[PDB]
Amino acid sequence: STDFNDKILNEPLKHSDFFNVKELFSVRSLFDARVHLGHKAGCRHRFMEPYIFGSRLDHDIIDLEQTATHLQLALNFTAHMAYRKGIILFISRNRQFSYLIENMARDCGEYAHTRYFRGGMLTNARLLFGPTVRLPDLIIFLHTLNNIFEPHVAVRDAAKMNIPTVGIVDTNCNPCLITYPVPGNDDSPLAVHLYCRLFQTAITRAKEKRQQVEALYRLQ
Amino acid sequence: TYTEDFIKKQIEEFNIGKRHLANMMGEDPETFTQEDIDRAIAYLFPSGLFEKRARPVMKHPEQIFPRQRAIQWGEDGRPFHYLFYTGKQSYYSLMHDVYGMLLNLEKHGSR
Amino acid sequence: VESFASMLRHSPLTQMGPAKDKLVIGRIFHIVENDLYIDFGGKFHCVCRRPEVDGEKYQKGTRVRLRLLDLELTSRFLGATTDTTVLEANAVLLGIQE
């Protein structure tokens, strides 16, 4: 199994962009999708200030040059986890996008949780699911806030369970405990559709790449 | 608690008993049915107890034992359903289907 | 390659300046009885009432004229360190865009 590991699981980690996620987006695309639009200066969170380009007439503008790098890192991580056959769970309590997120999760062969988050799903999964249940290996937050503008309980729960998290963080969100935060607009439908498209594409490409690599290895 | 091996042994025992009952009653085992099982058990073990459940009965084991314990993930541990982590995969899948149909229609006695 | 600063500088939303009393073109994308959700290119949509005149013409995909009042409705209340947002824009529906 040493040869299997060294050629399949360790080889992708030696390349900067093994799945070519840099070509899935550009700053022009993010601008067209209105990813740079943030909330008012009054709703600003302190920890989001380093990601804010400025305030245009009291409206925060997100710096898309930073969004590009953060999104590159997040997409690369998501692709690598999909390559390793890890369980990926999307989470969002924005009801405007629940149907879209569940459809996207069904399409890429991953999991979604867009409904009410019951206490202990992660920290007490063993009682609520069974003694042998396998928890997610990665959790992607398309909206980190619940409907009260307080952080989703899943952020802290996944931090407790040592599960990495990707997260779309708007100017009023708290990015401290998200492993791979992506500053961006999480309200306009164009931006959310772009995020769903990108993550679906990355996961699908990673899975196809894994199958191709395994087939080639078996052949040779 | 009933292990799957226990239920498996119960199924094979029930099939052997089905063929035995078909033998005793003279019927063809190939076409022997559950209604025939009920009638034959009523004849061979007559019982006038008013409680319908209390009479002797020969059911397929799945009818007897609670078999709602269906596994929701495979050997690798990946759950089968994309809404598994909600804990109500069936109900929320149904709600998702209904919402999708309502979206489609928008784009376009009994109880 | 165009930098983000140039894109922001030449953006129509930036060119608009203050949003108070500006005429914009919005598109209806969702209807609930007599309630129209209109996107005009900002961060948030605006929720308007179906006008009593020619109300049948206001359907999904329709182009309407709006007079903006505020791009996002927020307000600070007593004993609060952060603004509360209704996640909505304020606009006045004028009519159909011919």
Partner: peptide, 6 residues
Amino acid sequence: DPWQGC
């Protein structure tokens, strides 16, 4: 409620 069912 515009998103009734979600």
